[PDB]
Symmetry: D2
Subunit: 297 residues, 4 copies
């Protein structure tokens, strides 16, 4: 027949299996707080910073109602939030099959629900990835332990020439972060994925697909950014200390969704005033109130 | 006489919202385990095996899922709800039939204790068949708590809940031992909240309150703020990683109290075998820890 | 008679009096480590990032030999380091009287020896301040406790219109950080300063002087930067945790002077190899060695 | 018999360079006070007032400036140098004339201890007039230390310094009590370094080594890395800020041992009056701390 561009977001905030049991037995990792807010506020704030307003949250059946209770339909923050369940954790690239109907014919963005980013001109780094309407965009960050991640190899010109998932002998220390930008080809790339030996559909196979077509942009997220680790109990604790230090220093919050919707002009002063009221007695609501007065450059 | 325990893990209101908007504080981890493991481990260390967990209606199912009926750790867990947050002393009205004609002990679900000879320090409270024991602890901010005042001879002469002008820096901790009188004292309480400090004052007036000092060489950790939640997890991380030993591991404590045997400990470590907690429980079977 | 532009740096790493006694009784604050290196490496690294190679370190008479033992004459790192003593702490603006001969007819830069900065495109933020050959440049950063600092007030257009030192009622939450860029007028501005009521020559009077002549640029250092606090034992501990978290995450060091001189091309591979050798057994020397191999973007 | 003390605060080589390039580790603060205050406070808590500080030649003047002759805190401090880092047992050759015919105790200048009833735990070692006492502590990484092996009955049967295959996870801590034999045992040692574990093995072979367990409810903190230095300061910050009480404050401990009086404590707090440490010492004059 005959047919005659915006970008949707997906947050994968599914099962971390038993790795962090028993800490995570009664509740999933992405609802645990990092200092003063739930973990999912951070990657959600990241999507919002990319200008993305229509967002699918993928979680386990057990925990979806709790994600729904925390976040609603998004209307309070100028967003539209929908929900989908992942019955079993079959790999990150399942997000695109699970989210196939949500995505439709649009461009998309995947963020892991346990990743947090901090640093200056992050809005602008996401802007270039979001503005690119063709191909895929990922970010490479220097890490101590690249063997844990998808690793990107660069030629002497600085061109990305290979990707490898958890290599025993990394070709560089540049890990692919858990924020991915995709055009309309990804659902089709995802549907042709064959499981890997450990029973998972690998995002690195999706990104390699783009690489082999010449449509993978790999931007460096520099060392002046913090891409923090929530993979261990220890790293979770370091992520909370990190955010506490920045917030207590500056009197500004990292990854406050109310604030970000306010600054984007997705909600207005009066709506922000309403969101503050039920939290007026604690520091978070008193912080939302203070935003109405102050110019923050 | 057998002593029954109660963990009160009720609501903290909106004070830590949005961090606790999704789920109650006592289910969140402190470092490597759910917060409630810590006060539970305290009761177990006092020899207490029959225990009532009281939480909000929304969250009981989840305490219940986490901990079950206790039988896997040689405990006998029961559960009950606190519909609204109307004071710690409701624990004894909600827990009345559970307690029966027995001695009891109440620990708050968010209190963490650490230190040497804690088993002994709780032994002396536990073995008192008569009266009540509580613990006083020096703190920077006594206004936040029940404050005990002492005479020059070291005798408790008043308790005050959240006084504007604390009489001392001694704060009553969230661990309480009681005889058969506490239910009836709980039942005649009048709202101020139904205050645990009124329960303890009732025993004080009758010369039946033992106020033992919990010395400066014990850790009574603060989980009342986001900052103090953090310091607590850092505090436990430092101890566990220095020693290769875990703080408030119920499976280990059951095993050491001989409430479960080596074969049961082995089955418990099986599901967790690929991570550090299972590896740890496996390592306990063949190492002597003094 | 008849006469016929580079920028020199000064690090003020003098007396913190008795405020941090007894921690600082046997040694000055600026030699205490922040995680894995001495505190003075951080502000020194900041000057180096601004392209500054000729640097005066001002310390107490008691501690100069220890600053000299740590840092030498700078030749090992492609720098020229000189030393001057401050017999009594009479205020930060004394740096210009103490450093009058060192400065000569050049432009200058003052950094406090206990300030540390982290964040992306810091090189570029310093570049604009350093390239400005006229007037003064300072940086304003949002803090929880502006009452502790020099506070900058902005009009609705975002123009700086006043400065106040430790105001009881701050006009904004924007504090002036401890990095200052100056033209050839500063030594003369400094020499006319009259002590303040508490017996100190105030840098805020110097900056107000520039403001009243229309030659103070106040650039915002955004919230995506960390300007960390070493004013208390607590904040010192948070600064060390902060740097440990970033360094252990990335496998890169913050404020490694050897690395920065290497990357600037002030020293070469073989010199860096020599600086590594006496530290080869510890993580710091093994890190200097690894830099010779790897491309870090 | 009077027992004299030695703090060994010698060189850590280049291991923490460049952080310690400027000055030795034991002069750096842990949170709010210089590291050496902590092992010093340990000796004081054991009743030890006559103390020899041994440090590198470069740094002695500065230990000497920091601490003086001790008289202001009711101590009697002396000082001596360790020219090179040739093993902890040199402490007894360097300290030989200082020790004389007396009993002695050696603490490493970078060891931190915390916990309840520490005064008592050191009392039982201190009061032994014969033989040597050391402390064993469970740790994750016993290879880094002197490792003690026990028989099924809990008796020490071997000590090994930094074994490649530790026999247990029990590590000997950096606090050692000795009788009059240690100098002569130190003097017959042969370089392996002159090893403190050889000194302790000499007493073991003669049935004269008391190996007491320092339980899991005590903190023996690690200052051997940059990471463990940090965890230690965080650990002390959390205790001091929770309690409003300081850990290892020599002035306070002198005052409580009645080695200095209220008027002396008052003069000590005067120079520090504008900061928290002086304010703290002033606050100790009019508060009862149990
Ligand atoms: N840039 C901001 C902002 N600022 C904005 O989102 C913003 C939005 C529109 C215009 C200007 C600034 C904020 O309010 N909170 C915040 O954490 N950041 C940093 C951030 C945001 C999301 C994820 C990681 C870091
Ligand atoms: N004392 C123990 C023990 N020891 C025991 O449970 C025990 C009990 C009876 C006999 C032998 C060991 C332990 O295994 N785990 C633990 O965390 N502690 C300390 C502790 C226990 C509860 C709360 C805070 C600290
Ligand atoms: N930008 C760098 C760099 N990179 C450089 O200095 C550099 C120098 C010349 C060209 C490219 C990069 C570094 O090596 N270490 C470092 O801590 N930073 C960040 C930094 C440097 C100084 C003060 C605060 C943060
Ligand atoms: N026990 C005390 C005390 N208590 C005393 O010194 C003391 C000694 C004799 C009688 C009464 C109190 C103190 O004041 N400060 C302190 O840090 N402690 C614990 C301690 C002391 C040294 C090292 C590690 C922990
Ligand atoms: Cl960067
Ligand atoms: Cl104690
Ligand atoms: Cl920014
Ligand atoms: Cl113990």
């Amino acid at each position: 027949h005959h047919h005659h561009m915006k970008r949707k977001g997906i947050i994968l905030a599914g099962g971390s299996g038993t790795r962090l049991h028993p800490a995570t037995l009664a509740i999933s990792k992405q609802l645990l707080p990092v200092y003063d807010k739930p973990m999912i506020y951070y990657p959600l704030s990241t999507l919002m910073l990319a200008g993305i307003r229509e967002i699918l949250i993928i979680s386990t059946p057990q925990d979806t109602p709790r994600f729904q209770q925390l976040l609603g339909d998004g209307s309070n923050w100028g967003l539209d939030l929908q929900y989908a369940v992942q019955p079993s954790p079959d790999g990150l690239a399942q997000a695109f099959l699970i989210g196939e109907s949500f995505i439709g014919n649009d461009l998309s963005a995947l963020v892991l629900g346990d990743n947090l980013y901090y640093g200056h001109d992050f809005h602008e780094l996401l802007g270039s990835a979001s503005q690119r309407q063709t191909g895929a965009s990922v970010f490479a960050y220097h890490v101590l332990d690249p063997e844990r991640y998808g690793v990107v190899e660069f030629d002497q010109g600085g061109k990305a020439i290979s990707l490898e998932e958890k290599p025993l002998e990394p070709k560089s220390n540049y890990a692919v972060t858990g924020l991915y930008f995709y055009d309309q080809q990804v659902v089709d790339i995802a549907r042709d994925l064959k499981p890997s030996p450990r029973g998972e559909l690998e995002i690195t196979d999706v990104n390699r697909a783009y690489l082999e077509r010449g449509q993978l942009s790999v931007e460096i997220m520099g060392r002046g950014y913090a891409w923090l680790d929530t993979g261990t109990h220890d790293s979770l604790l370091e992520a909370g200390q990190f955010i506490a230090t920045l917030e207590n220093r500056q009197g500004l919050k990292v990854a406050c969704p109310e604030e970000i919707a306010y600054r984007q002009k997705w909600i207005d002063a009066a709506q922000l005033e309403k969101l503050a009221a039920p939290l007026a007695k604690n520091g978070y609501g008193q912080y939302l109130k203070r935003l109405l007065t102050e110019t923050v450059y």
